[PDB]
Design a protein around this motif. Structure first.
Motif, PDB file in Angstrom:
ATOM      1  N   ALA A 183       0.894  -1.185  -0.156  1.00  0.00           N
ATOM      2  CA  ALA A 183       0.095  -0.125  -0.010  1.00  0.00           C
ATOM      3  C   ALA A 183       0.890   1.188   0.145  1.00  0.00           C
ATOM      4  N   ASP A 184       2.175   1.089   0.635  1.00  0.00           N
ATOM      5  CA  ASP A 184       2.880   2.442   0.706  1.00  0.00           C
ATOM      6  C   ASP A 184       3.245   2.647  -0.690  1.00  0.00           C
ATOM      7  N   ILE A 185       3.715   1.988  -1.603  1.00  0.00           N
ATOM      8  CA  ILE A 185       4.076   2.187  -3.029  1.00  0.00           C
ATOM      9  C   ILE A 185       2.816   2.476  -3.855  1.00  0.00           C
ATOM     10  N   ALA A 186       1.847   1.789  -3.713  1.00  0.00           N
ATOM     11  CA  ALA A 186       0.617   2.249  -4.414  1.00  0.00           C
ATOM     12  C   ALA A 186       0.242   3.698  -4.117  1.00  0.00           C
TER      13      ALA A 186
ATOM     14  N   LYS B  54      -4.864   5.787   2.213  1.00  0.00           N
ATOM     15  CA  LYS B  54      -4.704   4.361   2.101  1.00  0.00           C
ATOM     16  C   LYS B  54      -5.250   3.830   3.425  1.00  0.00           C
ATOM     17  N   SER B  55      -6.687   3.416   3.117  1.00  0.00           N
ATOM     18  CA  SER B  55      -7.520   3.045   4.528  1.00  0.00           C
ATOM     19  C   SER B  55      -8.500   2.129   4.030  1.00  0.00           C
TER      20      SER B  55
ATOM     21  N   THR C  49      -1.808   9.556  14.247  1.00  0.00           N
ATOM     22  CA  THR C  49      -1.585   8.186  15.008  1.00  0.00           C
ATOM     23  C   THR C  49      -1.124   7.199  13.949  1.00  0.00           C
ATOM     24  N   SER C  50      -0.391   6.155  14.000  1.00  0.00           N
ATOM     25  CA  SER C  50       0.192   5.267  13.042  1.00  0.00           C
ATOM     26  C   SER C  50      -1.166   4.181  13.062  1.00  0.00           C
TER      27      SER C  50
ATOM     28  N   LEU D 115      -9.124   2.527   9.523  1.00  0.00           N
ATOM     29  CA  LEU D 115      -7.892   1.746   9.745  1.00  0.00           C
ATOM     30  C   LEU D 115      -7.050   1.876   8.401  1.00  0.00           C
ATOM     31  N   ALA D 116      -5.787   2.339   8.684  1.00  0.00           N
ATOM     32  CA  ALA D 116      -4.832   2.328   7.502  1.00  0.00           C
ATOM     33  C   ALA D 116      -4.646   0.882   6.727  1.00  0.00           C
ATOM     34  N   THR D 117      -4.600   0.811   5.455  1.00  0.00           N
ATOM     35  CA  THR D 117      -4.489  -0.638   4.810  1.00  0.00           C
ATOM     36  C   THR D 117      -3.210  -1.359   5.426  1.00  0.00           C
TER      37      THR D 117
END
Ligand SMILES: CCCCCCCCCCCCO[C@@H]1O[C@H](CO)[C@@H](O[C@H]2O[C@H](CO)[C@@H](O)[C@H](O)[C@H]2O)[C@H](O)[C@H]1O
Ligand SMILES: CCCCCCCCCCCCO[C@@H]1O[C@H](CO)[C@@H](O[C@H]2O[C@H](CO)[C@@H](O)[C@H](O)[C@H]2O)[C@H](O)[C@H]1O
Ligand SMILES: CCCCCCCCCCCCO[C@@H]1O[C@H](CO)[C@@H](O[C@H]2O[C@H](CO)[C@@H](O)[C@H](O)[C@H]2O)[C@H](O)[C@H]1O
Ligand SMILES: CCCCCCCCCCCCO[C@@H]1O[C@H](CO)[C@@H](O[C@H]2O[C@H](CO)[C@@H](O)[C@H](O)[C@H]2O)[C@H](O)[C@H]1O
Ligand SMILES: CCCCCCCCCC
Ligand SMILES: CCCCCCCC
Ligand SMILES: CCCCCCCC
Ligand SMILES: CCCCCC
Lengths: 1044, 48
Positions: free
Chosen positions: A100-103, A131-132, A169-170, A293-295
């Protein structure tokens, strides 16, 4: 290894203990989740164009961004909504497993090429890339118990003091404020503006000029002159901070020197950036944060970090302010996992009790009992080693594993016993000879068993990640169980077992055991007596066997199949959708009815309602709303009628009698990403520049046609909104030119007044916030109000809108959909009862082919994958069967004998199907895994029976029947000990009520029925299989009796 | 069939095919051999 550790019990203990420490440590660090992640990552781009209609958003923002979306890896599809709130959302969905970071990086690299082409007003609202997950993890609500802050006050407090830290928040992928941060609102009055010959253009210019923060340099700044003594910053204009200051902004001085201040042409107040979103908690003023929630993030960890951050804020709240918890998906995860843990403990206790009933000696029963937790704990360590989490499926893997583990220990402990009884050999010497004779088999069995559980690690798609959790958990546990049976158990037998004297069988005992032991010894002779009989018969029993097979087959094809059960997770949502054109006031009236219903008719079930006007899964709009509902604890909601399914069903039914609105309550699925077990998600596509009106007509035609096939299709409907009246104003260029009024002044006056305009920022109590200009409400409510707005011409004359414009009513869309960059309309529907999704889809396809030229279609979401394709089951269990056969052939050094074991398979299935058919269960994940377990165990039982018979016939010279009978009789007890320990062990599961009992019930009942039939049927049938197979596939050389 | 010129074809490709192709699985970059249509205003300096 056994001989080594028999003489080194302490070394054996040390290995057990370290394995347990490793497991305990894994348990402390291992992520906990409901399920493994299977949702395709999705990246969403969001943008806002204040005051824009849907077509303006689409043609000026959405198309531009979409055309720049290319060369992005792993993209499955793209969709977008452009709406008359001025909002765009573009969703890019990626292949499972995409980072997901790269997407997100790849999406944004392309977005930044579009950014400069977007209207300035859109860029200044801030476009975001997130990205969630699409659903809310939780809603944190905020109220004021002293009733000393209004809805607007609380929303601003939350926006200004709480939202940013939560958003940082992470694991927090997206935060929606249910309300709006304050802005400085300048509410213009067209009458006063015209009176002083001013327009919104002059107002905006004055605000930019007089609410400014200017860089002014320094006295004695570098480079300075020689001898300089003073250095100080120069401070000039600073941002305004209060309504008082904005009110005295000087617009102009009259000819007679009188002053025109901003407050002379406008009302000035702190008020929301927008006024679309208004929430209540149990009927009172509230605000809140809807958190997604983040992916890929851990739900439980993220929720803990959110609470930790909230706790840092609480001590600084204004009086009366309080956090409430109206909707949280995570407690159910924690609680349901913990209930499975309880069953594990309980299961081990029950195992201890059954062991005692048979072993009748604290120290002996302890052996099989210690073995379980040792293996289970080690299994957690292995899960950590492979990067698995603790989830519902790994936990049920553990539970199911207990049957396999305890049988390993029992086989080892029981066999030693029998030895000390058959010979009076002491404990140390007996386990040696015992291990000598089974150890080979334990290892071989673990091998054939891996052949039944591994294949499922290879299921494809989303399905596959689920089955894989079990496969790896159960295989690892079995492998560890063999290790433990080869190291710890022998050492333990040799030091903790009581010397049994040759011939002793506990009949000497007085009290219950003496009695029990006598009954069993007796019932055993009765067992063998019966088999001995059956073996003189037969023929008839092969006929009974075929009955069971056909019956099994009958029940199988009749048992409906599903995936994972819907669970009552103690929360649910209610969707409210009014027709576009409906007012915020009407939506509130419907929300009040919804709230009223939960507060009065579901008093006993519903703890709280957090209702939001102006937000739905759309999102924003005057004609939409949502209610988040939290239920009381499962324990206070005993009975089917008080679970989510029946509550949501009753609610929807009551709400059906709400006029001019679609309102429905529903339980979330186990996995949305998977959807409605029956639904399809269809996209109608404009492939040829047809345009919205023609696409609508095509849509309507398709809907009409579908409405005629109730035998196949149900509830085929659009997902979007209907066209509504809109007010079309034509600016007359020639008249504007004639009067000397600029088109820019016209458009800014119109837009600022009726749409509002974000001018610049100000500082409110130390925080940067926005300044908005807009007409006071009463001058932008009626069509006739348009002509009350004046623009100043070049020659200084004030000219009313009515002089250079004309207007008419027309229809247009409040929400335009695109799919893969083309105009689209999404259509939802489902298979009619008795019909398959595939059937319904085939038919949708047929009707779609009949549509007008230029109209195409596609499948998306749940329907996308999906074809894809289904049923891998037959192929994979086919290879499973083959590998099992091959493994057994190696074990027995025979191509024929394996059938005498494999024929037991149906005997457990039948009971599983019976019990499931009986409780109204489905052929789902839990049914399948429990069956493999039951099959594994009955296979193991049969393997050890024919292993014994075969050896007898081979090592000793025993003849066929004699050997079968001696084998079957030596094996009865161990088989019964295991069957009873495990059937009791899963009792807590079939009996379960409360969090996750759907899953628990499904696991337990299949196993219980399977084990019952497997046990009773196998102890009679296996001896049959064996002799019948030994005959058929022999070669004139008996069946006496020979030797040696 | 003699109904579309080169420039017509290029517009059709640019406007109806290229975007989708460029979002297709495994496709890294796509070059159009031609040009999408634009609204062209061809000015005459004498009339100006
Ligand atoms: C024969 C022994 C049986 C129990 C042995 C216990 C061994 C270790 C258990 C620890 C893990 C969790 O254990 C258990 O978790 C759940 C979740 O909160 C609680 O079980 C639940 O009780 C009621 C109804 O059953 C629930 O509505 C409530 O949500 C929860 O408290 C139990 O009170 C707790 O005992
Ligand atoms: C018969 C034996 C075999 C069965 C045993 C299986 C048990 C299954 C456990 C699953 C759920 C446990 O969940 C996990 O528990 C521990 C317990 O504090 C937590 O760990 C947390 O508490 C302790 C302190 O008390 C800290 O060491 C740790 O830093 C902290 O994160 C985890 O953050 C949580 O995720
Ligand atoms: C390379 C990829 C694939 C790997 C190969 C797959 C392996 C499949 C093997 C499964 C069964 C193995 O099981 C193994 O069989 C042999 C042969 O009977 C047994 O060997 C034992 O029993 C037999 C027969 O009673 C004796 O002749 C033998 O002397 C004794 O040691 C082992 O005790 C047992 O553990
Ligand atoms: C000898 C040792 C091993 C012997 C094997 C014994 C196992 C017997 C039970 C296995 C399960 C059979 O059950 C079968 O499962 C598959 C999916 O997994 C189902 O498949 C169906 O539902 C799923 C839903 O997710 C779809 O993806 C699939 O396309 C569809 O056809 C079948 O409807 C069902 O018939
Ligand atoms: C953690 C449990 C320790 C078990 C001690 C074993 C005692 C047996 C000594 C022979
Ligand atoms: C899987 C079929 C094996 C057939 C074995 C026959 C041995 C005589
Ligand atoms: C998978 C094929 C096994 C066949 C064995 C046949 C033995 C005679
Ligand atoms: C699926 C049955 C739901 C009840 C669980 C509490």
């Amino acid at each position: 290894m056994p001989n080594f550790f028999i003489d080194r019990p302490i070394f054996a203990w040390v290995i057990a203990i370290i394995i347990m420490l490793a497991g305990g440590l894994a348990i402390l660090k291992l992520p906990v989740a409901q399920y493994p992640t299977i949702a395709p990552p999705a990246v969403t781009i969001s943008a806002s164009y204040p005051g824009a209609d849907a077509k303006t958003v689409q043609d000026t923002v959405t198309q531009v961004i979409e055309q720049n979306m290319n060369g992005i890896d792993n993209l499955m599809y793209m969709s977008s909504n452009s709406d008359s709130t001025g909002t765009v959302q573009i969703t890019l969905t990626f292949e499972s497993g995409t980072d997901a970071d790269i997407a997100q990086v790849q999406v944004q690299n392309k977005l930044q090429l579009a950014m400069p082409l977007l209207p300035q007003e859109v860029q200044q609202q801030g476009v975001s890339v997130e990205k969630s997950s699409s659903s809310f993890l939780m809603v944190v609500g905020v109220i004021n118990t002293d009733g000393t802050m209004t809805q607007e006050d609380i929303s601003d407090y939350v926006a200004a003091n709480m939202k940013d830290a939560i958003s940082r928040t992470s694991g927090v992928g997206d935060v929606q404020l249910f309300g709006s941060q304050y802005a400085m609102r300048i509410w213009m009055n067209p009458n006063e503006l015209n009176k002083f010959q001013l327009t919104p253009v002059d107002v905006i210019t004055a605000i930019k000029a007089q609410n400014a923060q200017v860089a002014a340099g320094q006295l004695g700044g570098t480079p300075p002159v020689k001898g300089q003594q003073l250095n100080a910053s120069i401070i000039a204009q600073t941002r305004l901070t209060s309504t008082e200051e904005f009110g005295k902004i000087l617009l102009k001085v009259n000819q007679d020197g009188s002053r025109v201040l901003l407050r002379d042409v406008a009302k000035i107040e702190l008020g929301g950036e927008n006024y679309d979103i208004i929430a209540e908690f149990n009927g009172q003023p509230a605000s809140g944060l809807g958190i997604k929630l983040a992916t890929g993030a851990n739900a439980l960890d993220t929720a803990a970090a959110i609470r930790a951050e909230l706790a840092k804020m609480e001590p600084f709240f204004p009086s009366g302010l309080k956090i409430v918890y109206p909707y949280d998906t995570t407690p159910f995860v924690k609680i349901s996992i913990h209930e499975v843990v309880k069953t594990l403990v309980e299961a081990i206790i029950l195992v201890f009790l059954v062991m005692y009933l048979f072993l009748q000696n604290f120290r002996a029963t302890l052996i099989p009992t210690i073995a379980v937790p040792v293996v289970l704990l080690g299994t957690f360590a292995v899960l950590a080693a492979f990067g698995f989490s603790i989830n519902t499926l790994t936990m049920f893997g553990m539970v199911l594993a207990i049957g396999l583990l305890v049988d390993d220990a029992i086989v080892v402990v029981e066999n030693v016993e029998r030895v000390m009884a058959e010979e009076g050999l002491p404990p140390k010497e007996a386990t040696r000879k015992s291990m000598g004779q089974i150890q080979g088999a334990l290892v071989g069995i673990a091998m054939v068993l891996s052949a039944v559980f591994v294949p499922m690690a290879f299921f494809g798609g989303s399905t596959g990640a689920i089955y894989r959790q079990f496969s790896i958990t159960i295989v690892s546990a079995m492998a560890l169980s063999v290790l433990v049976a080869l190291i710890l158990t022998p050492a333990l037998c040799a030091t903790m077992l009581k010397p049994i004297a040759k011939g002793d069988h506990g009949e000497g005992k007085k009290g219950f055991f003496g009695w029990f032991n006598r009954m069993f010894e007796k019932s055993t002779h009765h067992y063998t007596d019966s088999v001995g009989g059956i073996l003189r018969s037969t023929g008839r029993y092969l006929v009974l066997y075929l009955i069971i097979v056909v019956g099994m087959a009958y029940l199988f094809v009749r048992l409906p199949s599903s995936f994972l059960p819907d669970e009552d997770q103690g929360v649910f949502m209610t969707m409210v959708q009014l027709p576009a054109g409906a007012t915020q006031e009407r939506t509130q009236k419907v929300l009040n009815e919804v709230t009223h219903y939960y507060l009065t008719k579901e008093k006993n079930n519903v703890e709280s309602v957090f209702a939001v006007n102006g937000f739905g899964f759309a999102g924003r709009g005057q004609n939409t709303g949502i209610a988040f509902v939290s239920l009381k604890d499962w324990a206070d909601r005993p009975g089917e009628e008080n679970k989510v399914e029946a509550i949501t069903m009753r609610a929807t039914r009551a709400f059906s009698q709400i006029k001019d609105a679609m309102v429905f309550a529903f339980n979330l699925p186990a996995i949305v990403e998977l959807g409605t077990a029956t639904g399809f998600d269809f996209e109608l596509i404009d492939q040829a520049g047809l345009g919205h009106e023609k696409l609508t007509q095509a849509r309507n035609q398709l809907l009409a046609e579908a409405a005629k096939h109730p035998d196949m299709l149900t509830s085929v409907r659009p997902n979007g909104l209907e066209d509504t009246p809109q007010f079309k104003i034509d600016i007359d260029q020639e008249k504007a030119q004639a009067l000397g009024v600029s088109i820019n002044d016209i458009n800014t006056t119109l837009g600022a007044a009726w749409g509002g305009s974000y001018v610049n920022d100000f500082i409110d109590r130390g925080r940067v916030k926005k300044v908005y200009v807009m007409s006071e409400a009463k001058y932008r409510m009626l069509p006739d109000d348009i002509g009350d707005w004046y623009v100043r011409a070049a020659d200084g004359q004030m000219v009313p809108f009515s002089a250079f414009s004309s207007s008419r009513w027309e229809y247009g869309s409040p929400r335009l959909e695109r799919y893969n960059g083309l105009p689209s309309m999404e259509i939802l529907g489902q298979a009619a009862p008795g019909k398959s999704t595939g059937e319904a889809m085939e038919l949708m396809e047929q009707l779609a082919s009949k549509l007008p030229t230029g109209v195409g279609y596609d499948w998306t979401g749940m329907s996308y994958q999906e074809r894809l394709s289904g049923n891998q089951a037959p192929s994979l269990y086919a290879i499973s069967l083959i590998v099992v056969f091959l493994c057994l052939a190696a074990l027995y050094e025979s191509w024929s004998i394996p059938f005498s074991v494999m024929l037991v398979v149906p005997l457990g299935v039948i009971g599983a199907l019976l019990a499931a058919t009986f409780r109204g269960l489905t052929n789902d994940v839990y049914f399948q895994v429990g069956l493999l377990t039951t099959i594994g165990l009955s296979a193991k039982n049969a393997i050890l029976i024919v292993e014994f018979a075969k050896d007898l016939m081979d090592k000793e010279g025993k003849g066929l029947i004699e050997a079968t009978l001696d084998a079957v009789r030596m094996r009865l007890r161990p088989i019964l000990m295991t069957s009873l320990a495990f059937i009791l062990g899963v009792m807590p599961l079939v009996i379960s009520t409360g969090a996750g009992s759907g899953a628990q019930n499904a696991v337990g009942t299949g196993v219980m029925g399977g084990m019952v039939t497997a046990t009773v049927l196998a102890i009679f049938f296996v001896p049959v299989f064996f002799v019948v197979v030994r005959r058929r596939f022999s070669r004139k050389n008996e069946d006496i009796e020979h030797s040696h």
